[PDB]
Design a protein around this ligand. Structure first.
Ligand SMILES: CC1(C)OC(=O)N([C@H]2CC[C@H](c3cnc(N)c(-c4ncccn4)c3)CC2)[C@H]1c1ccccc1
Ligand SMILES: [Zn+2]
Length: 211
């Protein structure tokens, strides 16, 4: 009924596959490490498959709708997501009702192809005040969580800024904020319907200090 978390073993190719994507999508960010910490690698301590009959089924039902309106192409894609609400997400699914127009963001759920981008948000916008125990955005002690999700993008509307969007434009199912000068540095994939993202993998890790 609820969700069941399935431990993958490091010997399992799926485990290796998921970690590789994470480690390899670490990229340098213009903030000197202020948001997600200074690190050149992660210590992946755990990777669990998220199994939830209800959620999978809703996700599949939505994927079919988007498909009929996108010429039978649901445009599914694997993307990362980091936020202080992962534990809620893996049990109740993504819920746009917690997405609000504010600051540099529209009322949608944001994803990223780069694991280090998602890491910048695990403790809040701009990293917030860091981990709860040491209030350190660069804590190497506390364990972090991020999701490698299945994301139904359907027909994406491309634009430079995504901060005052309430829903995907007419005819579309997602919005991609693209790089610009004086703008974004990495593309941001946004959905406005929770059902368009299934949290396939729960990644437990720590950023490692440089050597
Ligand atoms: C900047 C935004 C646009 O990028 C996101 O992806 N955000 C999501 C993160 C998670 C959130 C969310 C999505 N699904 C949920 N299910 C819950 C959630 N929270 C509390 C209780 C129950 N559920 C929260 C909505 C916006 C936002 C966000 C908000 C605050 C911190 C980090 C990230
Ligand atoms: Zn800490």
């Amino acid at each position: 009924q609820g969700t069941i978390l399935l431990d993958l073993a490091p010997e399992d190719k799926e485990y290796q596959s998921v970690e590789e994507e994470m480690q390899s999508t670490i990229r340098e960010h213009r903030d000197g490490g202020n948001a997600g910490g200074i690190f050149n690698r992660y210590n992946v301590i755990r990777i669990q498959k998220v199994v939830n009959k209800k959620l999978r089924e809703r996700f599949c039902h939505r994927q079919k709708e988007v498909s009929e309106e996108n010429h039978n192409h649901h445009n599914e894609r694997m993307l990362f997501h980091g936020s202080p609400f992962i534990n809620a997400i893996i049990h109740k699914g993504f819920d746009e009702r917690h997405a609000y127009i504010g600051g540099m963001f529209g009322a949608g759920i944001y994803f990223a192809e780069n694991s280090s981008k998602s890491n910048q948000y695990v403790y809040g916008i701009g990293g917030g005040t860091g981990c709860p125990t040491h209030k350190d955005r660069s804590c190497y002690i506390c364990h972090r969580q991020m999701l490698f999700c299945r994301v139904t993008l359907g027909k994406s509307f491309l634009q430079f800024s995504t901060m005052k969007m309430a829903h995907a434009p007419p005819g579309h199912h997602s919005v991609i904020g693209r790089p610009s000068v004086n703008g974004l540095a990495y593309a941001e994939y946004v959905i406005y319907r929770g059902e368009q993202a299934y949290p396939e993998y729960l990644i437990t890790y720590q950023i490692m200090k440089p050597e």
